[PDB]
Design a protein around this ligand. Structure first.
Ligand SMILES: C[C@H](NC(=O)c1c[nH]c2ncc(C3CC3)nc12)C(C)(C)O
Length: 281
């Protein structure tokens, strides 16, 4: 339905945690016989003002999003409150990449890259900045299909502005953040592009822990945030993943253009990745 009765949503396990919200695997079981469909249900675990309004927004946003490459909204449910979503058993991409490594050539990484870019293109066209783009936040619909998830921090851009300024600090691993976010808490469709660069790096390192974004800044060597800012200002960048084809490194480096306005758009990126995907073969 679009509306789920809480009494029929039946609990199975934890799938994830996030700022003040959990997502759970539930069976939606109106018969009560274990034959009902599986669903991923997000609730907030804190009942204050701003986190509750933010959650409502996230629902408004995801409801109004229709794309093969965006996680699918199924409905809400009420108490007097919960967000119900399609469930993707293969789960997290970060993990999926680590497991199936030996089964995935460059085409497929490019295939995923294209699909994520396409979803981000669309997100951008709805004026939606995602703000927390990263392999851990991408779900796997199948071996040849991925989808962007976790709208917990997404913002709508007012009609008259192309950027958002966040008051408090971020709480995500620092290594996916654009410089303007690090220094000024400025997020935009173009800071999303910065992070998409890092997602590509993740695809092509197959999310390996030993050469992760974090592991690399560490190697590349005062507050962490400040040092990462100095580096990125000096023009230090993540290196070509091992075996990475060069053309892809260049796209990354381009996504990492110092100023937001030199970064290419998702709609520029999409064809290039497409050409690359039909290039390997
Ligand atoms: C925890 C959160 N997940 C969701 O919102 C999910 C929505 N549908 C899913 N299907 C499988 C999984 C399995 C991967 C848990 N997660 C989710 C996220 C991965 C986006 O941070």
């Amino acid at each position: 339905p679009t509306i789920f009765e809480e009494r029929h949503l039946k609990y199975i396990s934890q799938l994830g945690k996030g700022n003040f919200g959990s997502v759970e695997l539930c069976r939606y079981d109106p018969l009560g016989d274990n034959t009902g469909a599986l669903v991923a249900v997000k609730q907030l675990q804190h009942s204050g003002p701003d986190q509750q309004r933010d959650f409502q927004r996230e629902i408004q946003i995801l409801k109004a999003l229709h794309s093969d490459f965006i996680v699918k909204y199924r409905g809400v449910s009420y108490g007097p409150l919960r967000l119900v979503m399609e469930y993707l058993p293969s789960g997290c991409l970060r993990d999926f990449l680590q497991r199936h490594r030996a089964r995935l050539d460059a085409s497929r990484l490019l295939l995923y890259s294209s699909q994520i870019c396409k979803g981000m293109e669309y997100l951008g066209s709805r004026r939606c900045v995602h703000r927390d783009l990263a392999a851990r936040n991408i779900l796997v619909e199948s071996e040849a299909h991925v989808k962007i998830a976790d709208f917990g921090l997404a913002k709508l851009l007012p009609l008259d502005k192309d950027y958002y300024v966040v008051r408090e600090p971020g709480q995500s691993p620092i290594f996916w953040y654009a410089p303007e976010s690090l220094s000024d808490n400025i997020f935009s469709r173009q800071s999303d592009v910065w992070s998409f660069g890092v997602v590509l790096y993740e695809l092509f390192t197959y999310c390996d822990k030993s050469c992760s974004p974090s592991a690399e800044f560490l190697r590349m060597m005062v507050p962490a945030l400040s040092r990462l800012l100095e580096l990125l200002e000096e023009g230090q960048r993540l290196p070509a993943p091992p075996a990475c084809p060069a053309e892809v490194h260049e796209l990354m480096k381009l996504c990492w253009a110092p100023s937001p306005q030199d970064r290419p758009s998702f709609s520029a990126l999409g064809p290039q990745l497409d050409m690359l995907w039909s290039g390997s073969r």
